[PDB]
Amino acid sequence: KETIKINNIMIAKYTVLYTSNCIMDIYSEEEKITCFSNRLVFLERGVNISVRMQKQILSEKPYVAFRLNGDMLRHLKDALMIIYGMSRSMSRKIMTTEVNKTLLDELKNINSHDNSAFISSLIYLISKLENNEKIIESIYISSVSFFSDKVRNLIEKDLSRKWTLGIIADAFNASEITIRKRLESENTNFNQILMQLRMSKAALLLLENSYQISQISNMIGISSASYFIRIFNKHYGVTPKQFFTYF
Amino acid sequence: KETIKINNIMIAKYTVLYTSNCIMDIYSEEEKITCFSNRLVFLERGVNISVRMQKQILSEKPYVAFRLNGDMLRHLKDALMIIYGRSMSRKIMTTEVNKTLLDELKNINSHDNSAFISSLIYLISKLENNEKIIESIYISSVSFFSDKVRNLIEKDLSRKWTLGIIADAFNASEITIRKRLESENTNFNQILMQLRMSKAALLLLENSYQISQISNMIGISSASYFIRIFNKHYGVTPKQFFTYFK
Numbered sequence: 001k002e003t004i005k006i007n008n009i010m011i012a013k014y015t016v017l018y019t020s021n022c023i024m025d026i027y028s029e030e031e032k033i034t035c036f037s038n039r040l041v042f043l044e045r046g047v048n049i050s051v052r053m054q055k056q057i058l059s060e061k062p063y064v065a066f067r068l069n070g071d072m073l074r075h076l077k078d079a080l081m082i083i084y085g086m087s088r089s090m091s092r093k094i095m096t097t098e099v100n101k102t103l104l105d106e107l108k109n110i111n112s113h114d115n116s117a118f119i120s121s122l123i124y125l126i127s128k129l130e131n132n133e134k135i136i137e138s139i140y141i142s143s144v145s146f147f148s149d150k151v152r153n154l155i156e157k158d159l160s161r162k163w164t165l166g167i168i169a170d171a172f173n174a175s176e177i178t179i180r181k182r183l184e185s186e187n188t189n190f191n192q193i194l195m196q197l198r199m200s201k202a203a204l205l206l207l208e209n210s211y212q213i214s215q216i217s218n219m220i221g222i223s224s225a226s227y228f229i230r231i232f233n234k235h236y237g238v239t240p241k242q243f244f245t246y247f
Numbered sequence: 248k249e250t251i252k253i254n255n256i257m258i259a260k261y262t263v264l265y266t267s268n269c270i271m272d273i274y275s276e277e278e279k280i281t282c283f284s285n286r287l288v289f290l291e292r293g294v295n296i297s298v299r300m301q302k303q304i305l306s307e308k309p310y311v312a313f314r315l316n317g318d319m320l321r322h323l324k325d326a327l328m329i330i331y332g333r334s335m336s337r338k339i340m341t342t343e344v345n346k347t348l349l350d351e352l353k354n355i356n357s358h359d360n361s362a363f364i365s366s367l368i369y370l371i372s373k374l375e376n377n378e379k380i381i382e383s384i385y386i387s388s389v390s391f392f393s394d395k396v397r398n399l400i401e402k403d404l405s406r407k408w409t410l411g412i413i414a415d416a417f418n419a420s421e422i423t424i425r426k427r428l429e430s431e432n433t434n435f436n437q438i439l440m441q442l443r444m445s446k447a448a449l450l451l452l453e454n455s456y457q458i459s460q461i462s463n464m465i466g467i468s469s470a471s472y473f474i475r476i477f478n479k480h481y482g483v484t485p486k487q488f489f490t491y492f493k
Contacts, residue, residue: 075329079368082325084361105347116330120372123326127365 002055004246007237009051010196013067014142015043016122018099018107022062025052029090042095042135045073045142048196049094053246061247066110076119077143080136083123087140095134103128147182151193159198160221165190198222199235206240207247213240249302251491254482257295257441260314261387263367264288265344265352269309272299278335287352289340289380292320292387295441296339300491308493313355323364324388327381330368340379348373392427396438404443405466410435443467444480451489458485 017040024035028049035041037056043049055062068076081087099107106121126132126139154171155163168190169176183189198220205216217228232240264287271282275296282288284303290296300309315323344352351366371377399416400408413435414421428434443465450461462473477485 078329079326082322082329083364083368102350114372117372119330120368123365124369127362127369 002058003053004242005050005052005237006243007050008196008199008235009049010200011043011045011047011049012200013069014045014073014139015041015068016066017041017043018064018066020063021056021060023054023056024063026050026094027052028094031090033090033094033096035096038099039096040099042097042138044093044138046146046148047090047093055246064107072115072119073139073143076122077140079119079123080126080139083127084132084136087137092134092137095138097129097135100128146186147179148186148188148193151183151190152197155194155197159201159219163190163194195231195235199232202228202232202240203236203243206244209244249305250300251487252297252299252482253488254297255295255441255444255480256298257445258290258292259445260316261292261320261384262288262290262315263313264290265311265313266341267310268303268307270301270303271310273297273339274299275339276335280335280339280341282341285344287342287344287348289342289383291338291383293391294335294338302491306493309491319360319364320384320388322360323367324385326364326368327371327384330372331378331381337379338383340383342374345373391431393431393433393438396424396428396435397442400439400442404446404464408435408439440476440480444477447473447477447485448481448488451485452492454489461485 017035019035019037019039019041021037023037024041026033026035026041026049028047053062103125106125110118110121112118126135129135150172151168154168161167165176165179169179172179179190183193201220202216205211205219206213211219213228214225217223217225220228222228222231229240232238232243236243238246264282266282266284266286266288268284270284271288273280273282273288273296275294302309348370351370355363355366357363371380374380395417396413399413410421410424414424417424425434428438447461447465450456450464451458456464458473459470462468462470465473467473467476474485477483477488481488483491
């Protein structure tokens, strides 16, 4: 059909999504946010969400996404801390707004080149928005580094290794218990971090259409291909085929 | 007529001007830059220029100006230093304004400094060879010696300032103050004259004050003296200046 329900979607980069040809019911932090067609969604870095999407036009893609790397996010952060002044609910983590045709011109003039101009245009849009304070807080709070972030960096160094909690401890020159606490404070466990890393990398590589499922599996650190397919299903709720075909 | 030539116009705030209904021949540093109608001009802080303006429609104002205070300029500077990392040609720069950029030029407001600095960012991003403009903003964000003297004199434009006073204030010698000022091609008397004549021009255009009031405000004893000095400095009578700018 034109309808999908994907689970455990992790936002790893500050994301600005334009619903375009899809209606999205987002479930996160035991809350529900419905994004209508022709809206802009602001997903902050780190929210684990689930989505129920209904495509309007089937032949085309669902939505239009804009993800911000660390450098761009930090620069936007500092710019917003100069422009609008220096400085825990889903309502302030996933925020939807209505986009004007004038803003639509910029939404078509967005380009992955001229990153200077891209950050400028984000500044401009944020300026042209009612109640932008919410959005602004997200951009800044999504710039801080947590345990989940340092652990994720260390694990991203070699996703194929047989990581354990002892390894993490040795690397951080601390004890297993202490690492367990830096994680538990942020409602995560080492196994969850590792599983999200691998399934997110796998989803991206899958959509790249440049790699076999065996290649994807060996890349993220999974031994067999059948095993990988079963885990992808158990995590997202769909087979890599269903996921790929939907987009 | 609809044509005026004003001398010794000093830009005290980074200025973005929309020529609108005027043709401007700007003369400075033995150079000539002609801004055509329906253009945007970027004049950096500090350029002493002379202008020949030609109005297309007489009843209206010549141009539409946008001046940046120190704090706003500094904030724009910092934003531009996060985003992007000697000749008049790189101090006075003119460009053609697009309907989109013009629409933003109308969506300006002197209250939401955040929105204005953002709009400057947006426009600057949409510009060919914007590096020139950006350099102007950053060099016009620098604090020179002449600016410190200017602020000190600004504290009380009516006082009979002398070079001894300025020297004592900076805890240095007269020679040193004179030469540090001369390094930026200025003298204490020029700083004071520019301060008073600029404040006078603004007050005059405010249409809320008489020439006697203007005179006493900038620190000048008689009104006749003020008018003669205004004419000698800018080249026009306060009447001519005012009537030209409606």
